[PDB]
């Protein structure tokens with residue numbers, strides 16, 4: 001088969017990582033012990049993408065759990081589906097990053113990365129045909145941010161012809177009171193734009209605004225935000241996990257989603273938070289995007305949409321044309337037929353039908369401009385710079401990450417203004 | 422003798438192979454286990470169906486076919502399907518990693534790992550032939566294997582088999598069932614690369630087949646299964662002259678002489694009749710005149726184009742079933758005095774006719790009504806260049822911005838190959854224009 | 862008949878040579894793309910050494 005090796009680093013990575021494994025374990029009908037107790041053969045046709053099959057029909061997640069502090073490790077191991085993960089695939093330090101990107105990337109993390117790579121290599125070598133890696137982490141912290149981007153670079157050195165996918169959670173003052181997060185985010189984006197092929201931009205600003213403004217969840221907990229992430233991560237992997245024709249693997253998705261290598265930052269979307277018409281209208285609405293960007297402030301380069309549940313497939317085709325026709329100005333004309341629609345007839349838990357959205361929109365610059373706005377004010381202040389230079393970092397490495405993100409924004413702007421003739 | 426070896430490349434080729442070889446088996450009364458009670462020459466023979474089937478001592482009739490796909494899930498369905506006993510395991514070849522809708526991976530990165538093994542298995546079939554006629558290659562234009570690996574195979578076949586004839590059944594991309602945004606790139610790359618190595622290519626526009634299934638068969642959302650059973654009927658009509666004998670039977674090679682006036686102009690337009698549902702065929706007999714006139718309704722063509730805005734360079738009618746020349750001549754005489762039929766000035770205007778008395782066949786539970794007589798028209802029309810124009814325009818839109826080109830360069834290709842391929846397509850479009858001009 | 866043999870051989874020859882050049886040209890380009898990638902990854906490892914060195918020369 002075509003196996004994906006999952007990696008979750010830092011606190012955020014392990015939090016959303018564990019919920020991801022909880023949701024897809026139930027969708028594939030395996031219990032926290034690892035035995036299968038489902039009813040549909042479609043659950044097992046492509047199970048090897050995410051699970052290792054052991055003796056006695058025992059399915060073990062192909063997952064590697066990493067963090068510079070042993071705290072989160074006990075949380076996952078004690079939480080549901082904690083006894084399903086492989087004990088040897090737990091790689092935890094004791095020092096702790098403390099939201100220092102330099103610690104995760106150059107100092108503390110550089111000393112644990114090798115014992116992580118040993119686990120990556122052991123899982124990889126047992127793959128029938130490894131297709132690539134997917135990493136869950138945040139960009140505002142130190143481990144998931146700094147070490148997460150180190151692991152990606154290290155893995156790319158040994159597997160340069162494989163796909164590197166990430167679910168990167170973007171920082172927002174509405175969720176985390178830590179003030180230095182725009183430093184860690186900018187330093188990370190400098191790495192993700194160079195060493196990843198596909199990055200799902202999970203924006204805490206959007207997750208917060210959705211819970212607060214749409215779900216009416218004043219004081220939203222991390223459990224509320226991660227319920228959206230889990231439903232999203234389940235949606236954007238449906239094509240990998242169940243039998244399908246379209247974007248069935250990580251490479252075919254990238255070819256359909258990435259017209260230029262640097263422009264590989266997707267804004268996902270989900271619905272509902274029904275009829276096929278309003279399922280389609282919601283998923284293209286700014287309120288249902290998991291990135292705090294308005295798609296009607298830019299143009300779509302490419303779009304992938306998967307519908308889940310029992311529904312009329314004629315109606316899905318009719319309504320996807322309707323949205324593209326009535327919003328023709330918001331799709332670049334120099335890429336014909338850039339919107340692709342998939343349909344998986346096994347719905348998620350709780351919903352009779354849902355819709356997941358993956359857009360490569362030039363409006364994503366709004367997210368990078370937000371980070372740059374915070375970062376640039378902090379850099380002039382030179383506020384909290386000794387903690388980074390204290391680990392041996394230079395002031396230029398901050399400047400370089402800034403100008404690279406300025407280029408990314410201007411490159412997204414260039415192709416938004418581009419025309420066919 | 423005159424054996425033909427079929428090669429099915431990629432999902433479309435493989436899945437169309439299942440429909441074609443299932444349909445062939447039903448036409449010849451061959452069972453899923455390969456036994457053919459009516460065939461009394463056990464272990465061999467010179468019969469017409471032996472051009473496509475070999476025979477084992479145990480009485481099994483085995484398709485002279487190779488199935489190749491750089492991923493195993495499509496061919497696995499053949500290995501475990503109703504007709505798994507029909508094929509020897511060595512005829513079904515699979516890699517581990519597909520081309521990811523990338524011509525470069527199909528032709529180079531992945532294809533080079535398996536090209537030699539495939540050619541060895543094809544050679545193994547050829548050595549069982551007493552008079553190999555040529556190859557039939559089934560593939561999509563859009564997929565990475567169908568485009569990349571096919572063109573690699575066609576190049577290698579030209580080296581190992583010289584000028585032995587090579588025919589294509591090419592699936593032309595349509596957005597209703599498209600799987601990749603880069604299918605125009607793969608289409609132009611494989612067309613440019615195979616052009617010198619193919620003698621005749623029958624394009625099947627998925628949108629043409631999709632529209633016919635919706636309008637003529639009342640299929641709300643046609644699937645690949647609906648399309649492939651219709652495609653196999655057109656393929657079965659074209660190969661029927663090789664697999665059956667008859668007084669009025671005309672070999673496909675005789676049609677080929679008429680269909681290809683110049684080497685590069687080898688893309689005939691296919692038109693089939695009658696495509697009708699059981700519900701509609703009830704108490705409605707389609708006469709020879711009705712199905713023949715239907716061949717000149719653009720709604721019934723395998724490729725979306727308007728022959729009324731083009732010129733004919735050949736017109737072949739391949740009838741099968743209850744058809745007598747008398748009715749054909751009457752139907753043709755009527756059509757010639759009512760249609761927009763214009764031949765180039767350097768070619769005679771006569772229609773070439775073939776009749777196979779074996780009636781059309783349908784697969785159980787299929788959407789096509791079983792009819793007493795069918796016809797497939799093979800015409801060489803300048804209008805087919807419209808299909809090139811649409812593909813080239815979509816290519817130009819993306820290539821102007823170099824969208825997705827980095828996926829190809831990363832696998833070893835150069836921008837010069839894109840421009841070289843597009844320049845060849847521009848020359849081909851001019852070729853179809855020049856052949857349509859009147860003589861001085 | 863000598864011309865027909867000649868032309869059949871010339872087509873096989875030009876097809877064999879045109880293909881061999883493409884696979885060689887493609888092998889060099891793909892390897893050169895992989896080599897440039899690793900070199901860029903290898904120069905960020907060398908940079909990390911300079912950073913870790915700079916922390917030891919800070920005390």
Ligand SMILES: COc1cc2cc(c1Cl)N(C)C(=O)C[C@H](OC(=O)C(C)C)[C@]1(C)O[C@H]1[C@@H](C)[C@@H]1C[C@@](O)(NC(=O)O1)[C@H](OC)/C=C\C=C(\C)C2
Nearest residue numbers: 097098099100101103177178179180181384385386387388
């Ligand atoms: C008295 O005033 C204040 C006192 C403190 C912080 C602030 C204010 Cl105003 N402000 C503004 C902040 O935004 C908090 C933030 O720290 C946080 O991550 C959080 C734990 C508070 C931080 C310093 O900017 C982060 C990194 C530079 C990080 C700091 C560390 O974590 N380690 C490290 O190497 O780097 C460190 O040692 C463990 C503990 C915490 C520091 C101290 C300095 C408190």
Ligand SMILES: Nc1nc2c(ncn2[C@@H]2O[C@H](COP(=O)(O)OP(=O)(O)OP(=O)(O)O)[C@@H](O)[C@H]2O)c(=O)[nH]1
Nearest residue numbers: 431432433519520521522561563564565566567645
């Ligand atoms: N008519 C028809 N076209 C098909 C079928 N299956 C795939 N295609 C077309 O083939 C093109 C995509 O290539 P595929 O055949 O899916 O894949 P492939 O040729 O194996 O190539 P890879 O993508 O590299 O695996 C698109 O134009 C599809 O619409 C089928 O059953 N019928």
Ligand SMILES: Nc1nc2c(ncn2[C@@H]2O[C@H](COP(=O)(O)OP(=O)(O)O)[C@@H](O)[C@H]2O)c(=O)[nH]1
Nearest residue numbers: 010011012015138140141142143144145171176
């Ligand atoms: N949505 C979400 N964000 C989280 C979670 N845990 C941490 N984060 C975010 O991660 C950022 C801080 O990094 P964190 O993951 O805590 O630390 P690290 O291990 O040192 O990288 C903040 O922006 C948090 O909002 C979580 O469970 N859910």
Ligand SMILES: [Ca+2]
Nearest residue numbers: 460462465466
């Ligand atoms: Ca016999």
Ligand SMILES: [Mg+2]
Nearest residue numbers: 431432492519
């Ligand atoms: Mg395939």
